[PDB]
Amino acid sequence: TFPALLFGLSGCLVDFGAQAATSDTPDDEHAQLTPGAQNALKALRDQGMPCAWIDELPEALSTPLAAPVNDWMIAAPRPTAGWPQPDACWMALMALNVSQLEGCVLISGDPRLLQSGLNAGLWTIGLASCGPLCGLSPSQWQALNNAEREQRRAQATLKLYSLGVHSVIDHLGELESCLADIALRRSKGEKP
Amino acid sequence: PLPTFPALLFGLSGCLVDFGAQAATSDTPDDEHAQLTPGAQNALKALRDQGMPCAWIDELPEALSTPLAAPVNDWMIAAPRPTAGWPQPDACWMALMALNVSQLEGCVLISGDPRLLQSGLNAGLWTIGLASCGPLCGLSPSQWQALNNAEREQRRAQATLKLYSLGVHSVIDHLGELESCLADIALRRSKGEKP
Ligand SMILES: [Mg+2]
């Protein structure tokens, strides 16, 4: 079983290309859910899956960004010790009252958040298209040719695996299958 | 060389001090309960000399655990009390945070209390159980010493089986065995074993 799923906010649930930090101003476009995020969240709410979002942006920037998910998921309490310390992830799991670490998963495209999850002892899922390793807005990503999007994904994928991340997928539309494969690995005895 | 340990967590009562968890028998603090458990001075010198980050964990009221921590408070951190108590992982995670631990990997909890050990297992830690001094034995030093050898062996064996049944990783008779116990866990880790 999965006691909880933790999600990055920007460059993960919303803000494709992690553009909200790129400015000190809020921007309406950035609160858009990333490809596959809406339906992944529908499924998680229907399942009753405990979930929380995690980010390091100032509340002024993260509040408008979280609006799309605030009906699905709490903001984890911010630690005094930030990423890559494990604290953020432990405090998220604690806010969700999880009974045990085993089976908890963090999903992000940000290496600093992913490292927090790795340090904390969670399973980790990296996102290949929408995080800061790619850093392109939706319109920018769409303007590339096929070969370019492939190159960008593959490059981010290897960077993420080099961190020690357990699985990398293109987008949150792949989350369900990704989690099912972690379940199979776990049944074979794999631990984070 | 073998993998190293970044931090060690210890129960206070029935583990570092208070053989037989006798602080649970009275609301007022008893100076006799602050006696360190057999082998503790030996284990703790090695750890303190090494600069091993260590914190203690308990659930007793402050009126009791503060006096109990007297023989270790020169150097060992008191873990902050969690809102959600054992067997929730919170007590152990909060202790690791208090030690500014950078990774869960290799962290160990030592206790004879099944509820605290369960917290450590839930928190994802390595666990070492104590067969003599914890609540499953629940006898004061005088009561423990009044038994015969056979009765002490029987009680250690019973506690040892219960702790392994919980899923604890290694069980030892007392803290004098901690160094060797840790060395064998490091060897297991070197062979790819995880908690
Ligand atoms: Mg591909």
GROMACS .gro file of C-alpha atoms and ligand atoms in nm:
model
  388
    1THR     CA    1   0.000   0.000   0.000
    2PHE     CA    2   0.086   0.369  -0.031
    3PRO     CA    3   0.014   0.554   0.299
    4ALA     CA    4   0.066   0.894   0.129
    5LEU     CA    5   0.181   1.075  -0.181
    6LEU     CA    6   0.376   1.399  -0.155
    7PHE     CA    7   0.387   1.636  -0.454
    8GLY     CA    8   0.595   1.932  -0.553
    9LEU     CA    9   0.370   2.226  -0.632
   10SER     CA   10   0.547   2.433  -0.897
   11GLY     CA   11   0.699   2.248  -1.195
   12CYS     CA   12   0.494   1.941  -1.094
   13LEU     CA   13   0.122   1.987  -1.015
   14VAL     CA   14   0.113   2.328  -1.177
   15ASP     CA   15   0.351   2.582  -1.330
   16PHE     CA   16   0.491   2.376  -1.621
   17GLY     CA   17   0.862   2.476  -1.664
   18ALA     CA   18   0.883   2.614  -1.305
   19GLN     CA   19   0.838   2.973  -1.421
   20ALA     CA   20   0.689   3.118  -1.098
   21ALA     CA   21   1.032   3.154  -0.932
   22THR     CA   22   1.170   3.303  -1.257
   23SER     CA   23   0.974   3.612  -1.144
   24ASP     CA   24   0.904   3.791  -0.815
   25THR     CA   25   0.567   3.887  -0.963
   26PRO     CA   26   0.273   3.643  -0.968
   27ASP     CA   27   0.155   3.536  -1.318
   28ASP     CA   28  -0.194   3.393  -1.387
   29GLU     CA   29  -0.070   3.150  -1.655
   30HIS     CA   30   0.145   2.965  -1.400
   31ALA     CA   31  -0.153   2.838  -1.191
   32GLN     CA   32  -0.246   2.606  -1.480
   33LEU     CA   33  -0.232   2.234  -1.394
   34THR     CA   34   0.033   2.037  -1.582
   35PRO     CA   35  -0.061   1.770  -1.844
   36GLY     CA   36  -0.239   1.476  -1.680
   37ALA     CA   37  -0.245   1.644  -1.335
   38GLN     CA   38  -0.622   1.705  -1.324
   39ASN     CA   39  -0.717   1.345  -1.393
   40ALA     CA   40  -0.442   1.206  -1.167
   41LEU     CA   41  -0.587   1.417  -0.883
   42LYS     CA   42  -0.946   1.308  -0.959
   43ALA     CA   43  -0.826   0.948  -0.911
   44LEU     CA   44  -0.641   1.023  -0.590
   45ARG     CA   45  -0.940   1.204  -0.438
   46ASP     CA   46  -1.169   0.912  -0.538
   47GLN     CA   47  -0.922   0.669  -0.381
   48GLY     CA   48  -0.906   0.870  -0.056
   49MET     CA   49  -0.525   0.887  -0.098
   50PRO     CA   50  -0.365   1.114   0.163
   51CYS     CA   51  -0.162   1.379  -0.016
   52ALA     CA   52   0.018   1.704   0.056
   53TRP     CA   53   0.209   1.958  -0.155
   54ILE     CA   54   0.560   2.083  -0.081
   55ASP     CA   55   0.738   2.388  -0.214
   56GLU     CA   56   0.991   2.658  -0.116
   57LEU     CA   57   0.837   2.961  -0.296
   58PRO     CA   58   0.713   3.254  -0.083
   59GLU     CA   59   0.344   3.214   0.020
   60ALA     CA   60   0.253   3.512  -0.202
   61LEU     CA   61   0.372   3.319  -0.507
   62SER     CA   62   0.258   2.971  -0.393
   63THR     CA   63  -0.095   3.067  -0.278
   64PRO     CA   64  -0.228   3.155  -0.626
   65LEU     CA   65  -0.047   2.845  -0.762
   66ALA     CA   66  -0.212   2.609  -0.511
   67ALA     CA   67  -0.567   2.728  -0.588
   68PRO     CA   68  -0.626   2.455  -0.850
   69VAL     CA   69  -0.543   2.183  -0.589
   70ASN     CA   70  -0.664   2.334  -0.260
   71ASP     CA   71  -0.987   2.135  -0.299
   72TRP     CA   72  -0.779   1.814  -0.323
   73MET     CA   73  -0.480   1.850  -0.096
   74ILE     CA   74  -0.319   2.031   0.197
   75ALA     CA   75   0.004   2.233   0.199
   76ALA     CA   76   0.260   2.048   0.411
   77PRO     CA   77   0.392   2.259   0.704
   78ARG     CA   78   0.721   2.427   0.613
   79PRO     CA   79   1.031   2.304   0.805
   80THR     CA   80   1.285   2.541   0.960
   81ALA     CA   81   1.550   2.331   0.788
   82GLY     CA   82   1.486   2.342   0.409
   83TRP     CA   83   1.583   2.119   0.115
   84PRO     CA   84   1.783   1.899   0.079
   85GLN     CA   85   1.728   1.821   0.452
   86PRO     CA   86   1.477   1.536   0.501
   87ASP     CA   87   1.266   1.754   0.733
   88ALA     CA   88   1.016   1.882   0.474
   89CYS     CA   89   0.918   1.525   0.381
   90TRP     CA   90   0.897   1.395   0.739
   91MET     CA   91   0.688   1.692   0.840
   92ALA     CA   92   0.453   1.638   0.543
   93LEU     CA   93   0.402   1.271   0.636
   94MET     CA   94   0.344   1.374   0.998
   95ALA     CA   95   0.079   1.630   0.895
   96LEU     CA   96  -0.093   1.346   0.707
   97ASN     CA   97  -0.077   1.121   1.018
   98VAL     CA   98   0.078   0.834   0.818
   99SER     CA   99   0.125   0.517   1.024
  100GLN     CA  100   0.461   0.428   0.864
  101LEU     CA  101   0.720   0.546   0.615
  102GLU     CA  102   0.708   0.225   0.415
  103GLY     CA  103   0.533   0.283   0.084
  104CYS     CA  104   0.525   0.667   0.096
  105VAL     CA  105   0.624   0.837  -0.231
  106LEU     CA  106   0.740   1.187  -0.330
  107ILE     CA  107   0.670   1.314  -0.684
  108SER     CA  108   0.869   1.617  -0.816
  109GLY     CA  109   1.081   1.742  -1.104
  110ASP     CA  110   1.303   1.954  -0.875
  111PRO     CA  111   1.637   1.792  -0.778
  112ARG     CA  112   1.650   1.978  -0.444
  113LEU     CA  113   1.305   1.853  -0.339
  114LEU     CA  114   1.379   1.505  -0.478
  115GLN     CA  115   1.697   1.497  -0.268
  116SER     CA  116   1.491   1.580   0.046
  117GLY     CA  117   1.268   1.281  -0.033
  118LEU     CA  118   1.569   1.054  -0.100
  119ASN     CA  119   1.730   1.170   0.228
  120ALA     CA  120   1.401   1.119   0.411
  121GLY     CA  121   1.384   0.753   0.295
  122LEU     CA  122   1.084   0.781   0.058
  123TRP     CA  123   1.029   0.633  -0.286
  124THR     CA  124   1.082   0.909  -0.544
  125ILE     CA  125   0.924   0.975  -0.884
  126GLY     CA  126   1.096   1.231  -1.111
  127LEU     CA  127   0.908   1.426  -1.383
  128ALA     CA  128   1.093   1.461  -1.716
  129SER     CA  129   0.901   1.741  -1.895
  130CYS     CA  130   0.767   2.005  -1.654
  131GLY     CA  131   1.040   2.074  -1.400
  132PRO     CA  132   1.329   2.324  -1.380
  133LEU     CA  133   1.564   2.087  -1.565
  134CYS     CA  134   1.363   2.167  -1.876
  135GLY     CA  135   1.253   2.518  -1.777
  136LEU     CA  136   1.023   2.582  -2.073
  137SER     CA  137   0.672   2.721  -2.057
  138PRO     CA  138   0.388   2.521  -2.218
  139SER     CA  139   0.397   2.739  -2.531
  140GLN     CA  140   0.779   2.713  -2.548
  141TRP     CA  141   0.773   2.332  -2.506
  142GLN     CA  142   0.504   2.312  -2.777
  143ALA     CA  143   0.718   2.519  -3.017
  144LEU     CA  144   1.004   2.265  -3.018
  145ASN     CA  145   1.010   1.986  -3.277
  146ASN     CA  146   0.962   1.619  -3.178
  147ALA     CA  147   1.336   1.546  -3.169
  148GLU     CA  148   1.396   1.843  -2.937
  149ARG     CA  149   1.127   1.742  -2.684
  150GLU     CA  150   1.275   1.390  -2.684
  151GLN     CA  151   1.627   1.523  -2.630
  152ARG     CA  152   1.508   1.751  -2.343
  153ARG     CA  153   1.315   1.467  -2.169
  154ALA     CA  154   1.600   1.220  -2.203
  155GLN     CA  155   1.852   1.471  -2.066
  156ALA     CA  156   1.635   1.552  -1.762
  157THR     CA  157   1.563   1.179  -1.714
  158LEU     CA  158   1.930   1.090  -1.683
  159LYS     CA  159   2.001   1.384  -1.447
  160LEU     CA  160   1.715   1.265  -1.225
  161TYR     CA  161   1.828   0.900  -1.225
  162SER     CA  162   2.186   1.016  -1.145
  163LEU     CA  163   2.047   1.165  -0.821
  164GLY     CA  164   1.922   0.821  -0.719
  165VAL     CA  165   1.554   0.879  -0.805
  166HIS     CA  166   1.359   0.550  -0.824
  167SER     CA  167   1.144   0.610  -1.133
  168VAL     CA  168   1.117   0.884  -1.397
  169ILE     CA  169   0.804   0.949  -1.607
  170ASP     CA  170   0.719   1.219  -1.863
  171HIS     CA  171   0.414   1.370  -1.690
  172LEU     CA  172   0.148   1.300  -1.428
  173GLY     CA  173  -0.064   1.112  -1.681
  174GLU     CA  174   0.184   0.833  -1.620
  175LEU     CA  175   0.159   0.846  -1.240
  176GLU     CA  176  -0.089   0.557  -1.201
  177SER     CA  177   0.121   0.311  -1.402
  178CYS     CA  178   0.438   0.437  -1.234
  179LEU     CA  179   0.291   0.369  -0.888
  180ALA     CA  180   0.171   0.026  -0.997
  181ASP     CA  181   0.524  -0.063  -1.104
  182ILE     CA  182   0.670   0.056  -0.772
  183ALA     CA  183   0.413  -0.174  -0.605
  184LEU     CA  184   0.542  -0.467  -0.812
  185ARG     CA  185   0.903  -0.382  -0.723
  186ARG     CA  186   0.805  -0.363  -0.357
  187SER     CA  187   0.642  -0.711  -0.379
  188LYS     CA  188   0.980  -0.841  -0.505
  189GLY     CA  189   1.140  -0.700  -0.191
  190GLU     CA  190   1.274  -0.366  -0.316
  191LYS     CA  191   1.298  -0.083  -0.063
  192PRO     CA  192   1.389   0.284  -0.134
  193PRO     CA  193   3.560   0.005   0.568
  194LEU     CA  194   3.207  -0.078   0.694
  195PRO     CA  195   2.916   0.170   0.659
  196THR     CA  196   2.898   0.423   0.943
  197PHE     CA  197   2.605   0.535   1.160
  198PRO     CA  198   2.496   0.900   1.133
  199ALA     CA  199   2.288   0.912   1.455
  200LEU     CA  200   2.168   0.694   1.741
  201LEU     CA  201   1.835   0.730   1.922
  202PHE     CA  202   1.783   0.579   2.269
  203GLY     CA  203   1.482   0.525   2.489
  204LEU     CA  204   1.548   0.686   2.827
  205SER     CA  205   1.357   0.485   3.091
  206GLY     CA  206   1.418   0.105   3.074
  207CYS     CA  207   1.707   0.159   2.839
  208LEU     CA  208   1.974   0.421   2.929
  209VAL     CA  209   1.859   0.447   3.291
  210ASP     CA  210   1.578   0.310   3.511
  211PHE     CA  211   1.631  -0.067   3.474
  212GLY     CA  212   1.286  -0.229   3.467
  213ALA     CA  213   1.103   0.097   3.372
  214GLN     CA  214   1.025   0.173   3.737
  215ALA     CA  215   0.952   0.543   3.675
  216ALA     CA  216   0.614   0.419   3.545
  217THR     CA  217   0.528   0.303   3.902
  218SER     CA  218   0.521   0.646   4.068
  219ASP     CA  219   0.417   1.002   3.979
  220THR     CA  220   0.708   1.149   4.172
  221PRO     CA  221   1.072   1.125   4.062
  222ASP     CA  222   1.288   0.864   4.235
  223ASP     CA  223   1.667   0.916   4.246
  224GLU     CA  224   1.719   0.536   4.237
  225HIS     CA  225   1.566   0.521   3.887
  226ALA     CA  226   1.835   0.750   3.744
  227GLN     CA  227   2.099   0.472   3.784
  228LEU     CA  228   2.239   0.386   3.439
  229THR     CA  229   2.163   0.036   3.305
  230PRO     CA  230   2.437  -0.233   3.305
  231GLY     CA  231   2.710  -0.155   3.048
  232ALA     CA  232   2.576   0.198   2.975
  233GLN     CA  233   2.889   0.382   3.102
  234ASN     CA  234   3.108   0.168   2.876
  235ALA     CA  235   2.886   0.208   2.564
  236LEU     CA  236   2.832   0.582   2.623
  237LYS     CA  237   3.203   0.663   2.671
  238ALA     CA  238   3.282   0.511   2.329
  239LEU     CA  239   2.995   0.701   2.166
  240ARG     CA  240   3.065   1.034   2.334
  241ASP     CA  241   3.438   1.007   2.259
  242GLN     CA  242   3.350   0.933   1.892
  243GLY     CA  243   3.123   1.239   1.871
  244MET     CA  244   2.832   1.009   1.771
  245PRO     CA  245   2.517   1.228   1.757
  246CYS     CA  246   2.280   1.078   2.014
  247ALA     CA  247   1.940   1.184   2.144
  248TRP     CA  248   1.706   1.025   2.398
  249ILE     CA  249   1.334   0.970   2.354
  250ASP     CA  250   1.066   0.913   2.614
  251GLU     CA  251   0.694   0.965   2.684
  252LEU     CA  252   0.705   1.003   3.063
  253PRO     CA  253   0.589   1.336   3.207
  254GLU     CA  254   0.862   1.603   3.220
  255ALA     CA  255   0.862   1.582   3.604
  256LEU     CA  256   1.002   1.231   3.563
  257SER     CA  257   1.218   1.231   3.248
  258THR     CA  258   1.406   1.552   3.335
  259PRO     CA  259   1.558   1.401   3.655
  260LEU     CA  260   1.602   1.066   3.471
  261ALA     CA  261   1.820   1.234   3.205
  262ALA     CA  262   2.069   1.362   3.469
  263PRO     CA  263   2.344   1.106   3.388
  264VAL     CA  264   2.334   1.184   3.009
  265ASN     CA  265   2.239   1.552   2.982
  266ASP     CA  266   2.607   1.664   2.974
  267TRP     CA  267   2.614   1.567   2.603
  268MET     CA  268   2.304   1.383   2.485
  269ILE     CA  269   2.015   1.575   2.325
  270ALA     CA  270   1.663   1.546   2.469
  271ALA     CA  271   1.441   1.470   2.164
  272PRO     CA  272   1.142   1.703   2.143
  273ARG     CA  273   0.812   1.544   2.247
  274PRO     CA  274   0.582   1.480   1.949
  275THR     CA  275   0.216   1.574   1.932
  276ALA     CA  276   0.129   1.226   1.802
  277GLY     CA  277   0.270   0.961   2.040
  278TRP     CA  278   0.402   0.609   1.990
  279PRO     CA  279   0.371   0.399   1.773
  280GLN     CA  280   0.348   0.695   1.527
  281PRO     CA  281   0.692   0.761   1.361
  282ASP     CA  282   0.687   1.127   1.480
  283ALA     CA  283   0.891   1.078   1.799
  284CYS     CA  284   1.180   0.929   1.596
  285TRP     CA  285   1.167   1.172   1.305
  286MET     CA  286   1.155   1.463   1.545
  287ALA     CA  287   1.459   1.331   1.730
  288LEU     CA  288   1.652   1.297   1.403
  289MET     CA  289   1.559   1.656   1.311
  290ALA     CA  290   1.679   1.775   1.653
  291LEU     CA  291   2.016   1.619   1.561
  292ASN     CA  292   2.015   1.790   1.218
  293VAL     CA  293   2.045   1.446   1.056
  294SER     CA  294   2.094   1.470   0.680
  295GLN     CA  295   1.977   1.115   0.586
  296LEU     CA  296   1.757   0.844   0.740
  297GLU     CA  297   1.996   0.582   0.603
  298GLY     CA  298   2.193   0.413   0.882
  299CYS     CA  299   2.008   0.576   1.174
  300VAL     CA  300   1.939   0.338   1.467
  301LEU     CA  301   1.692   0.329   1.758
  302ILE     CA  302   1.782   0.134   2.070
  303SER     CA  303   1.498   0.051   2.318
  304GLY     CA  304   1.339  -0.231   2.518
  305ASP     CA  305   0.988  -0.085   2.484
  306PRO     CA  306   0.771  -0.249   2.215
  307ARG     CA  307   0.578   0.074   2.153
  308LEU     CA  308   0.884   0.289   2.101
  309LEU     CA  309   1.051   0.015   1.894
  310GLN     CA  310   0.734   0.009   1.682
  311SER     CA  311   0.768   0.388   1.635
  312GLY     CA  312   1.127   0.331   1.513
  313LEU     CA  313   1.023   0.054   1.272
  314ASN     CA  314   0.738   0.276   1.145
  315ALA     CA  315   0.982   0.567   1.104
  316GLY     CA  316   1.203   0.348   0.883
  317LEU     CA  317   1.495   0.306   1.126
  318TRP     CA  318   1.721   0.017   1.217
  319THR     CA  319   1.622  -0.114   1.562
  320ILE     CA  320   1.809  -0.278   1.849
  321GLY     CA  321   1.602  -0.434   2.127
  322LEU     CA  322   1.715  -0.477   2.487
  323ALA     CA  323   1.637  -0.810   2.656
  324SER     CA  324   1.691  -0.733   3.028
  325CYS     CA  325   1.607  -0.380   3.128
  326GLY     CA  326   1.279  -0.299   2.950
  327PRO     CA  327   0.906  -0.320   3.038
  328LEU     CA  328   0.865  -0.681   2.910
  329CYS     CA  329   1.090  -0.776   3.200
  330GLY     CA  330   0.971  -0.488   3.422
  331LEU     CA  331   1.182  -0.579   3.725
  332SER     CA  332   1.386  -0.340   3.938
  333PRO     CA  333   1.759  -0.410   3.978
  334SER     CA  334   1.688  -0.567   4.321
  335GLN     CA  335   1.405  -0.784   4.181
  336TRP     CA  336   1.612  -0.886   3.877
  337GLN     CA  337   1.906  -0.973   4.102
  338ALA     CA  338   1.681  -1.175   4.341
  339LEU     CA  339   1.589  -1.417   4.059
  340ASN     CA  340   1.810  -1.716   3.989
  341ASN     CA  341   2.017  -1.750   3.669
  342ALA     CA  342   1.757  -1.975   3.507
  343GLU     CA  343   1.479  -1.721   3.572
  344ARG     CA  344   1.688  -1.436   3.428
  345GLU     CA  345   1.763  -1.651   3.120
  346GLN     CA  346   1.393  -1.738   3.080
  347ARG     CA  347   1.287  -1.370   3.097
  348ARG     CA  348   1.557  -1.255   2.850
  349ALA     CA  349   1.459  -1.531   2.606
  350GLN     CA  350   1.087  -1.436   2.633
  351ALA     CA  351   1.159  -1.063   2.577
  352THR     CA  352   1.398  -1.149   2.290
  353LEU     CA  353   1.133  -1.347   2.104
  354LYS     CA  354   0.866  -1.074   2.146
  355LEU     CA  355   1.106  -0.810   2.020
  356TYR     CA  356   1.202  -1.018   1.713
  357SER     CA  357   0.829  -1.079   1.652
  358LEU     CA  358   0.778  -0.701   1.630
  359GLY     CA  359   1.034  -0.697   1.349
  360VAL     CA  360   1.332  -0.564   1.550
  361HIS     CA  361   1.664  -0.611   1.368
  362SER     CA  362   1.893  -0.731   1.652
  363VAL     CA  363   1.843  -0.808   2.021
  364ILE     CA  364   2.112  -0.780   2.289
  365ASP     CA  365   2.118  -0.840   2.665
  366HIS     CA  366   2.246  -0.494   2.769
  367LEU     CA  367   2.422  -0.181   2.641
  368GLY     CA  368   2.768  -0.333   2.702
  369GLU     CA  369   2.691  -0.529   2.384
  370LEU     CA  370   2.595  -0.223   2.179
  371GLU     CA  371   2.932  -0.173   2.005
  372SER     CA  372   2.946  -0.531   1.873
  373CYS     CA  373   2.576  -0.518   1.784
  374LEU     CA  374   2.627  -0.202   1.574
  375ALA     CA  375   2.935  -0.354   1.406
  376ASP     CA  376   2.726  -0.654   1.294
  377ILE     CA  377   2.449  -0.425   1.160
  378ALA     CA  378   2.717  -0.234   0.965
  379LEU     CA  379   2.827  -0.568   0.811
  380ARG     CA  380   2.464  -0.652   0.722
  381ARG     CA  381   2.437  -0.305   0.560
  382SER     CA  382   2.758  -0.372   0.365
  383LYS     CA  383   2.579  -0.679   0.221
  384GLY     CA  384   2.289  -0.465   0.098
  385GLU     CA  385   2.046  -0.513   0.391
  386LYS     CA  386   1.809  -0.224   0.462
  387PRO     CA  387   1.571  -0.173   0.756
  388MG      MG  388   1.042   0.857  -2.360
   0.00000   0.00000   0.00000
